[PDB]
Ligand binder design. Structure first.
Ligand SMILES: Cc1cn([C@H]2C[C@H](O)[C@@H](COP(=O)(O)OP(=O)(O)OP(=O)(O)O)O2)c(=O)[nH]c1=O
Ligand SMILES: Cc1cn([C@H]2C[C@H](O)[C@@H](COP(=O)(O)OP(=O)(O)OP(=O)(O)O)O2)c(=O)[nH]c1=O
Ligand SMILES: Cc1cn([C@H]2C[C@H](O)[C@@H](COP(=O)(O)OP(=O)(O)OP(=O)(O)O)O2)c(=O)[nH]c1=O
Ligand SMILES: Cc1cn([C@H]2C[C@H](O)[C@@H](COP(=O)(O)OP(=O)(O)OP(=O)(O)O)O2)c(=O)[nH]c1=O
Ligand SMILES: [Mg+2]
Ligand SMILES: [Mg+2]
Ligand SMILES: [Mg+2]
Ligand SMILES: [Mg+2]
Lengths: 271, 258, 259, 273, 271, 275
DNA sequence: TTTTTTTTTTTTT
């Protein structure tokens, strides 16, 4: 592995020739310009502040609009609970929270409309619901060729200090030499001082839990606030708290949550 | 292993296309589609927490009030004990832990044969060639096996014979596994919650099984018999965890839901 | 068939099932786990020097003066004299080996000797399972009590798997003592700290084989170490385990009696 | 080997040690006098507050203006993310953080005018990205002979226990400074705060806030701690704090530095409290 | 066999029972645990380097004039002449080791051999100069010299658990097997929750290095806790912890040092 | 056997009580409470990190190496032979030689440094040593044994315990610390030890003005048993008023706060200050 | 395979 600084005439050049956008909020698209090859983002909100809404939305948007293979690794739930929350979200309805509508649209041929509008040419990919998880994600990257890989709910993949430190180190070091956006989700701690995360705490960088290797091997911290006690509980207040590429840490904007469609859109709110 | 998005075409329709209730802990019927055939309900706890205190309670109310024929096999003990808790539970008076009422009656034949009068109970005192006759020659429908432990490669070569048999027959084949020798913190017995991790023996005690009940109870608390049920990995309705309160009620002896 | 139709399993149970050995001190043992049973390996385990042999050799006297059974003792922790000399002043309610005058003022010696020893009850002992196997065959023992265990992974369980076989063979009421491990978190046991079943030294099968566990929690450097907590930690045959009672000492005389 | 104190008359005088001075701030160069061969220097701050570009700037300033051969072992970000800061740093711009310019400069080939102004001097050496790291540094410094070596992100190299690993390595790296006589700036991180705000948010960092062990303030020679408040109203005024200087005996504030967005070269600000 | 009855015991009580060695300094001790007894093992607990050989050679001396026993001393913590300087100067009430002026004064006053045979003029004390060899060296004092109270100094090079309770249980069995009142010195462990023992802390029965049975096969536990950085480092706290033979324990006594001589004597101290 | 009595000990005490001395410099009270380093003892040096535990040893090796003629041997393991073979030069001649290059430009040519060499090191008083532990005390025994180094100084015990592959790093300490105290007490050579002070938890750390306690010795716990004198230093980097604590002297009967010193930013000498 | 203490730091509790 002895490489001098003189083997870099045509290897820098071809490395010149851009980040995959962030739908629903262009403020994250402003002060990061997306994500690169080897990047590891971190998405977080509180323990119950909708960390499963916008990540699922972005997995939707990067496969039905942009032609990039979104190979998920969701381990909150099984496969038939995330495929349906892809389809019913995409059709702007509530799929898995109404029993008659799951029976109404199963009757009349619109089912193989709503399967084939999404899952067609191997864009979306799903994972069978932890040191073999890395081997399965590398088999996912090498065999299928997916670009964005999401992992969720870090408590299942795991003194939970050395554990989560070795976990974040192993994924950060996995993202080398491959060119893959390995987005991970992790939880916030129980707030040892202050107002709670169920009450809309101002999420600092001092709230990640298990070890401080989460705010030290990331490449972006995207923090959401689903302030349910606030007068906009249909509003995820989104924030860049860490950037290795720019350094702008602040209110990129807002995104408004919708009930019936399940979506959340860019909003035009100010305080 | 990774399975692609093409494999879920009809299976959401198959996901959008109960049976034996759990008399005792009345939230489990709400959360694991009761009991169909071919299930392996796990009753997981540490030695003393209420393995056979709870698992034999199901066989009375699924042997008599359901009418389905039941094969018990409590190989941690013998037939003389497994043919008494049935009687003392069906007759509400504590048989085994009383002295004078053992010899008061000995109307023993009546409370023997009235609850053994069907072809319900076929009790047992290599092993599966003698166990598996319960379902073919006899008609049993709930089969409950207690002990597994003393009963690299000669360990994980067991559950396939049971699971293919459950596939072929359709029997509620409830087998008890145990907890383990702990390593850090409080042990299980004080009221520790046991998630999917804390199980030795094999991973098939919480993975290859279909639905997993765990019993936990504060032993040196206000009462040692406030058990509480947990689901580890449920496949029928997916949702797992805590249903609700049971209590054993030492006056009578039913782990009844509270 | 290995399965047996339970209706055709009748008379063998009709011929089958047709309190017992009480405990002096801590009347929430016999009221709760119902005395003693043949074939048992009971445990009286607490910390080292909590007064375990202020229980385990009080019971050997109460089971030879009112219960009349044969008691084959085993104290390796001292000699036959040093375990038998306390018994006489224990019977006579006078604290013998803790005041110098009455150690030799009496010598009414054989009055106090024969009235508790002229029965052929006690059989002391100064390998050990051979010399407990003779206590059945050549001596006729009815209660066996032992005191110290830690001298005679598998070297700690292959004594307990021989003692459980000896309780299997003869059905003898047996009491056995082992010791607590050292709590590296928090305090020590000796100021009222509750013990768990992991607190047993040596290895990790001295608690499979035992049929119950009894323990004294004693605030040793406390305001008084004369109010002990009895705790059952395991019971195969009554289920209800935990805080049994609180025993005094009554320092004028010295009786572990419930209060 | 046994020695005494009389057979050194003409080799004590050989020491009778010229430094390698910093850049950007000058009070750092007051109370350190540069850096010497056999001297382990340590830079700490939070994550992202300036532990890689502020060290690579000094790797350039010690590697194109002073002719000292400089080697890197960048383990965070590999060769092809770190050359395009060097190139876009020396030219007083922001290269990778715009596609208005990387698109332009390879059309005509003025990339080949901004490129060979630096690396054709053959003073830079890399290591492409956990104990024979020493043995590869030995040839990077014995045959190639880069006269400063930089180790990036030592908390991969600790990925047994912590106390055993990092001391068993750190002793062999201070004994790599000795017996080979190279300067060595090593990068190592911070443990979490207990109470209050953190070391990226702008906490006043102390000496025993390290992580990996407490044997990082013990086998090391100079502790330099940046304090970059990014939540305060001055988000790009970094502070520099010398926490432990063995060779002189001055501790406290060095000075202040400003970070300029359009250029990338941090400038010495003249902030007053 | 080796089986014994409890009928044939009229002889071997009649030939058994047909206080003793008090402890000088803080005479609540013999008021409470009633002196030493033959065939035991005794632990002096104090802080490390805090006087675990000042309250044991005093109690080697006070059993060598008024008791006349064949008192041994076994020192591994020092040499065979500094242990003898202090015993000469101790009863003579002049702090001797700490002064060289009085070691060049009465070398030629001729009262060297006078204060030698004033209290070594008997054949009372015996000594030794440096564990399985120590098995023979603790028994030859019992057989060859006829020693009565052996004091053994060190435990941590005596350990060169299998070397730690091998000592304590075997040399507890040898005590009751030969009647010699063996007295051994212990080391407290290195605590972590807060203070050290050396600054006024109270000690519990756990605090003994090596393994755990040093509290099992020892028969009494004597305490000293001296507040080094306080009003004085000389007021030790005495606390009795374990007592198989009377039972009563607790806060025992409070001594001073009486700085001219070197003699542990008490005071009626309330606090 | 070796069980020798106490009646037949008339002559061995007689040829003993006729050492005690070898006093410190830098302050007064460090010669009160310990009366210097008694030949035989173990003396232990603790400061924080970068707090002068080879300043107050490089300075006390000279007062024992010139003003008393005692053969002093220095095993400085932090460094090499050259940085410490010259740090005594300006020590003696009252300049800061390595810490300022202008004097290093002055005294090359005219040989003032050569007379500064031949003054101190022209005699035979100082011996030095450079750098597991299976040969450390083996190569330290020849200094007192053959060469007669009457004081030996050991620097940085933490880099003879961090250089071994063992099971634990505690047993490997206290299987060597016994050889250290035995080699000290047996031949009666003073052997001084440098060891460090571990992580604190709340408030000020040791380098910010923490009153260090005896249980804070990093590495093991028999460093407060097999020691005869423990010395601890404190400062707040008044960034030079270093005060001294003596933790435990096994010979005499008083320990505590020893004295105040101040370090000289021109010459190199610890002036005992006032406060 | 598992037992028993004894140092040194990390989250969280
Ligand atoms: C239970 C109790 C005992 N004691 C005293 C009476 C006896 O002197 C002594 C009883 O302890 P023992 O039972 O005699 O101790 P042991 O020989 O069993 O030791 P080990 O546990 O290590 O095997 O304590 C009290 O003073 N108050 C009490 O409440
Ligand atoms: C010092 C400083 C840097 N920056 C920017 C410049 C770079 O784009 C980025 C620095 O990133 P890096 O230097 O690459 O990373 P790091 O060493 O600080 O952190 P880690 O230990 O996790 O590897 O931050 C600011 O915006 N303001 C500042 O004051
Ligand atoms: C106990 C005590 C000791 N001292 C002084 C004078 C004593 O000679 C000295 C104690 O010396 P030692 O008793 O010899 O020390 P130690 O036994 O605690 O340590 P080790 O096991 O390593 O041998 O301390 C007092 O001043 N006041 C006191 O109360
Ligand atoms: C005490 C003190 C030290 N110093 C400086 C000058 C000395 O060269 C320096 C000490 O040099 P060293 O003795 O080599 O450093 P250290 O032993 O204190 O710490 P470590 O070896 O573990 O890294 O401290 C002062 O400037 N003023 C002071 O008051
Ligand atoms: Mg006993
Ligand atoms: Mg970086
Ligand atoms: Mg001593
Ligand atoms: Mg130093």
């Amino acid at each position: 592995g002895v490489v001098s600084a003189l083997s870099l005439r045509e290897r820098i050049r071809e490395h010149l020739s851009v980040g995959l956008l962030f739908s629903g909020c262009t403020g994250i698209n402003d002060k990061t310009l997306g994500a690169r090859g080897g990047e590891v983002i971190m998405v977080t909100s509180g323990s119950g502040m909708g960390k499963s809404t916008f990540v699922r939305q972005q997995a939707l948007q990067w496969g039905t609009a942009m032609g990039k293979k979104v190979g998920l690794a969701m381990l909150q739930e099984s496969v038939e609970e995330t495929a349906e929350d892809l389809i019913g979200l995409h059709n702007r309805v509530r799929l898995r929270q109404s029993d008659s509508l799951k029976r109404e649209i199963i009757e009349n041929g619109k089912f193989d409309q709503w399967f084939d509008e999404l899952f067609g040419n191997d864009t979306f990919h799903l994972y069978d619901s932890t040191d073999r998880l890395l081997a399965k994600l590398a088999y996912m990257r090498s065999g299928l060729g997916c670009d964005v890989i999401i992992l969720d709910h870090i408590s299942i993949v795991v003194d939970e200090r050395k554990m989560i430190d070795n976990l974040m180190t192993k994924l950060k070091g996995f993202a080398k030499s491959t060119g893959v956006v390995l987005v991970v989700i992790c939880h916030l701690k129980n707030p040892d001082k202050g107002k709670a995360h169920e009450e809309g705490r101002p999420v600092s960088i001092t709230d990640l839990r298990g070890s401080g290797a989460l705010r030290q091997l990331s490449d972006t911290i995207i923090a959401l606030e689903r302030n349910q006690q606030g007068d906009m509980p249909n509003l995820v207040l989104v924030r860049i708290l860490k950037c290795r590429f720019t350094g702008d840490t602040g209110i990129a904007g807002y995104m408004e949550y919708n009930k019936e469609t399940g979506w959340l859109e860019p909003s035009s709110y100010s305080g």
